[PDB]
């Protein structure tokens, strides 16, 4: 039987609750971490927050025209009127997305604002049969929809190199390299399992700052995700080059690349 072990692992910090259920075993709701809805630091990260360093737009409309400077930075604004990625968006090789910010002349409800509006999809933490906890959608999610951000503790590469527990790390590549470590502090994304044919793709996004060492990681759906479906993203080759020595992929794809 399916036990509800939390009505909201986010304790009201997201726009929607994210409940946790367990229909597999007697494991209680995960508690060996702290849920945070936004990135945090321990050691200082000198993120450039000088407001005069932001590039911004001077649009007089809703930023849906060809002329939006923020769109231009992104190659073009990739968001349609519903906040979804255009069909032309390259899922195999995503551009950097620069959303509008507080220095722009446009209004807070302009078109070029999606990730900064936060998590909206109805998600659920659940106990899988064979790879611990995972995350599923409770609803249909159309292609190109923002699902969630990979949130955690921003750390340097040298700090990551002395952290024994590296199973919750996302690399932010650049010669100055940083990571998000979601082991001790993280949001719902820390529970998303690896899939070799993933229904999510991580996109580098800039909002309140444009410090290129610290993109934020926004997962968008790569296809229609049907209600009940487990979320997955491709953890990438560094992960598997390390953990492949310890276990093989159980994503079960007929095209699995790490089995």
Ligand X SMILES: C[S@@+](CC[C@H](N)C(=O)[O-])C[C@H]1O[C@@H](n2cnc3c(N)ncnc32)[C@H](O)[C@@H]1O
Ligand Y SMILES: COc1cc2nc(N3CCOCC3)nc(NC3CCN(C)CC3)c2cc1OC
Q: Are strands 178-186 and 232-233 parallel, antiparallel or unpaired?
A: unpaired
161: contact with ligand Y by CB under 6 A:
yes
Residue 223 structure tokens: 């296809």
- Contact by Cβ (8 Å): 111, 64: yes
132: contact with ligand Y by CB under 6 A:
no
CA 156 to chain centroid, in Å, comes to 19
Residue 237 DSSP SS3: helix
Q: Please identify which residue in 26, 32, 43, 66 interacts with a second copy, judged by CB under 8 A.
A: 43
In the chain the first and final C-alpha atoms are separated, in Å, by 31
168: contact with ligand X by CB under 6 A:
yes
DSSP H helices, 74-167, are 157-160
Determine which helix (DSSP H) or strand (DSSP E) holds 88, and give its type and residue range.
Answer: none
114: contact with Zn ion by CB under 5 A:
no
Of the candidate spans 84-92, 128-136, 160-168, 186-194, the one that interacts with ligand Y by CB under 6 A turns out to be 160-168
Of the candidate spans 77-85, 140-148, 204-212, 245-253, the one that interacts with ligand X by CB under 6 A turns out to be 245-253
72: contact with a second copy by CB under 8 A:
no
Q: State the Cα–Cα distance between residues 217 and 14, nearest whole angstrom.
A: 17
Q: State the Cα–Cα distance between residues 229 and 124, nearest whole angstrom.
A: 10
Closer by beta carbon to a second copy, 117 or else 253: 117
Beginning with the edge strand found earlier in the chain, give each strand of the sheet holding 97-98 in spatial order: 97-98, 200-206, 216-221, 146-150
58: contact with a second copy by CB under 8 A:
no
Residues that bind ligand Y (CB under 6 A): 157, 160-161, 163, 166-167, 169-171, 177, 179, 235-236, 238-239, 242-243
Residues that bind a second copy (CB under 8 A): 11-13, 34, 36-38, 40-44, 46, 49-52, 102-103, 106-109, 153, 185
Residues that bind ligand X (CB under 6 A): 131-134, 167-168, 190-191, 193-194, 243, 247, 249-251
Residues that bind Zn ion (CB under 5 A): 57, 59, 63, 68, 70, 100, 104, 106, 110, 112, 196, 249, 251, 256, 258
């Amino acid at each position: 039987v399916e036990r509800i072990v939390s009505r909201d692992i986010a304790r009201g910090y997201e726009r929607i609750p994210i409940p946790c259920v367990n229909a597999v075993d007697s494991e209680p709701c995960p508690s060996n971490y702290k849920y945070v809805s936004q990135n945090c630091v321990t050691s200082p990260m000198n993120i450039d927050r000088n407001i005069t360093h932001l590039q911004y737009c001077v649009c007089i409309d809703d930023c849906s025209s060809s002329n939006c400077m923020c769109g231009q930075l992104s190659m073009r604004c990739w968001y349609d009127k519903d906040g979804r990625l255009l069909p032309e968006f390259n899922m195999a090789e995503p551009p950097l997305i620069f959303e509008c910010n507080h220095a722009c002349s446009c209004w807070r409800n302009c078109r070029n604002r999606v990730v900064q509006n936060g998590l909206r999809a109805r998600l659920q933490l659940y106990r899988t049969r064979d790879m611990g906890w995972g995350v599923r959608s409770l609803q249909d999610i159309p292609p190109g929809t923002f699902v969630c951000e990979y949130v955690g503790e921003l750390i340097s590469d040298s700090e990551a190199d002395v952290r024994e527990e590296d199973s919750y790390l996302f690399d932010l590549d650049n010669g100055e390299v940083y990571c998000i470590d979601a082991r001790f502090y993280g949001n719902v994304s820390r529970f998303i399992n690896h899939h070799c044919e993933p229904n999510l793709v991580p996109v580098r996004v800039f909002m309140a700052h444009q410090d290129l060492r610290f993109p934020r990681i926004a997962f968008f759906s790569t296809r229609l995700i049907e209600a009940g479906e487990q979320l997955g993203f491709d953890y990438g080759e560094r992960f598997w080059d390390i953990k492949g020595k310890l276990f093989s992929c159980r994503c079960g794809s007929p095209k699995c690349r790490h089995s």
